[PDB]
Write a protein that binds this ligand. Structure first.
Ligand SMILES: Nc1ncnc2c1ncn2[C@@H]1O[C@H](CSCC[C@H](N)C(=O)O)[C@@H](O)[C@H]1O
Ligand SMILES: Nc1ncnc2c1ncn2[C@@H]1O[C@H](CSCC[C@H](N)C(=O)O)[C@@H](O)[C@H]1O
Ligand SMILES: Nc1ncnc2c1ncn2[C@@H]1O[C@H](CSCC[C@H](N)C(=O)O)[C@@H](O)[C@H]1O
Ligand SMILES: Nc1ncnc2c1ncn2[C@@H]1O[C@H](CSCC[C@H](N)C(=O)O)[C@@H](O)[C@H]1O
Lengths: 201, 201, 201, 201
């Protein structure tokens, strides 16, 4: 994993998706699910992106954005919760501007997300083969580079149940080279130039 | 068995069956029979569906609904009235709104149906090959995915004796793939889009 | 159901099956499964037959016989456990000698099987559709007039799994008008004149 | 999952695999990996089968057997460590002899695997996608009914890295309906009649 992986998912979030969802709900609270969050780079990247949007658009989001980040419980999810990273992890995909604006040095070779970035993310233990019903409803779901490991039938079952967590017209973000197969009545492919997102029908 | 199996019967119940039965009986007390209740998923799904109709149609049900769930009494019957279900039993069929409104999160990997939903259900021991005279009269009978195990002659006799327990105009719900042939003087087919239910003539 | 139903199955047990099974195992413990025992007439008849064999052939049974009686849990299995019967049930198929030797009067119009006969019979709640592993191994299985109620697919699966409970060379007794005809690798029909039994291959 | 699933893999272990490996290592310590142990039925069945082997082969195993049971972290892995099972779980695949010899009755409808059987099993949380280096070397690996969840490329990688955990000539047990077909340099299929296992080349 790395920070702001592929660049354009987070630009699309700020430029395209957020203004559309805010216009419909009157700026009320939005919820984002970061599925298989690994060591936390993706959910914290989402948190920084929302912070950047909120600062440039005073004040379109009236209630903020909740990020729910999930993975299997253990030491990897535990470190994500701690929000600390070593130098090697911090040099992959993070501009120097974001490093100084959003992280605190500890600590020789240790950096931690700033409290405003940390507070948007709640980490929960969740197996993707289990039920998603405890997670609630989401305006956006990020499920990137995890579906690749499963069989075609299990991948379809996960995508179908992800659809049950999305509000209608919400968006699913997959990995850059991941296709969404055999659910033509559940997801609409949307071109972002660059990038592809999938609207929940 | 699973929660809200096949989706359509519990929506057809709230949108077509209940308004008709209320009209036919003046909104008075209704009785539902869940035959072959298995581990309790079906009768509790009925109770939840009754709760949902009540909130959207306040005052229409004047005295509530009583649910009688029967099966071959045994460890399975005992676990049904306990109302406890592990991670696998809660895995499929429960929307996020239903899991939060009708269940209690117990310990790790254990959930319990709320007592307000459990109250509507009463469990008894009853073999489908025995008499039903002790059960009383029902406006609705759920007898799903149990008739497949018997001979055509036993299946017809069960469906005929179920007619004896149904109030005139009462409704019978079978499995989504089960047929009700060979009984034209007793059951009227009601296509619902999607699914098929049967009215006692 | 009735006492010593069809008569000759219990004579074949005493004259033909017991001497063969006792000779091979040296008179050690025998186990008999009475599947679908109903109100108990069949297992108690078997226990009476064993007692008649034990007092006729002293002392070829050196370890006694265990009878496991199963049916669906309810007022017909609970009636069998008590071993009490009314005049109507006592008047069908019971000789006067067996009535005097094996029953106690229990008030007007009530009779009870003697404790010496009931002691051999253990009653267990068991659906024929569930697994049989907890039952152990049997030298004989009586499964009479219950398979008729099921579909062809369920009947064959029950018969196949019954074979898994039988010791090789053990015997299966069906109802007087029942047969099996699609398990050639598992059972061998044995003419008894009159009636038939099935040897477990 | 269930106790002694498919029956014959555990008989093959006692009759063929254990004696061959004992001669293949001189009776020293054996290690078994139960991968994807789920609620623990499989590793506890293995520990029971080893006990049954030890009661027949008078201490032909010099320094005992270690069983390592792994699965994803969650409620099911935590239930396995406890070793307690309800009536429904105890009623599938367990003979009356094994119930008495290897379980202690607890609460009403509750049984627990005896400490003599649990002590041989160590439970660890492990994603099969992660490295196996910390597990050491095994004479036998049970990886049953889990490979079907993954892509063809992940399945081959998992089986390839399982070979890295196996001692030369060690045995791999898959599910009854599973096979590997693209690792000709690493695995040799062994026919057992019935069923199949694989030997590490
Ligand atoms: N069954 C499962 N349930 C939940 N998470 C799983 C899983 N199997 C694998 N994963 C997780 O999926 C992650 C894929 S790494 C991808 C991280 C992030 N989404 C990104 O795009 O950079 C791993 O961290 C792994 O822990
Ligand atoms: N003779 C009989 N009398 C009562 N119940 C029976 C029965 N034979 C089988 N059953 C029950 O019927 C159930 C079928 S599973 C069906 C459960 C539920 N009706 C659903 O559709 O989801 C089994 O659990 C079994 O316990
Ligand atoms: N699924 C099932 N599992 C176990 N018993 C069942 C069953 N379905 C029906 N039965 C039982 O089978 C019995 C048939 S009456 C037969 C009784 C006795 N074997 C005789 O020949 O006279 C009934 O008492 C009924 O309770
Ligand atoms: N990525 C993964 N790593 C480890 N275990 C996994 C896994 N994905 C699924 N599993 C586990 O694989 C199990 C399959 S059920 C199989 C249990 C047992 N081996 C038997 O044959 O009966 C499930 O318990 C599931 O938790």
């Amino acid at each position: 994993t790395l920070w702001f992986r592929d660049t354009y998912p987070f630009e699309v979030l700020k430029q395209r998706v957020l203004p559309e969802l805010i216009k419909a709900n009157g700026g009320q609270r939005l919820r984002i699910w970061s599925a298989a969050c690994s060591s936390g780079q993706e959910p914290y990247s989402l948190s920084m992106a929302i912070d950047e949007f909120e600062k440039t658009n005073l004040g379109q989001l009236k209630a903020g954005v909740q990020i729910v980040a999930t993975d299997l419980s253990g030491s990897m999810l535990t470190a994500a919760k701690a929000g600390e990273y070593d130098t090697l992890a911090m040099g992959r995909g993070l501009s120097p501007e974001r490093l100084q604006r959003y992280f605190d040095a500890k600590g020789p070779g240790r950096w931690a997300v700033k409290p405003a970035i940390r507070s948007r993310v709640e980490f929960r233990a969740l197996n993707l083969l289990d039920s998603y019903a405890s997670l609630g409803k989401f305006d956006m779901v990020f499920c990137r580079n995890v579906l690749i490991y499963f069989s075609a039938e299990v991948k379809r079952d996960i995508l179908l149940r992800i659809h049950g967590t999305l509000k209608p017209g919400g968006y699913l973000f997959l990995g850059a080279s991941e296709a969404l197969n055999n659910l033509p009545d559940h997801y609409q492919m949307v071109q972002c130039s660059p990038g592809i997102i999938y609207r929940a029908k």
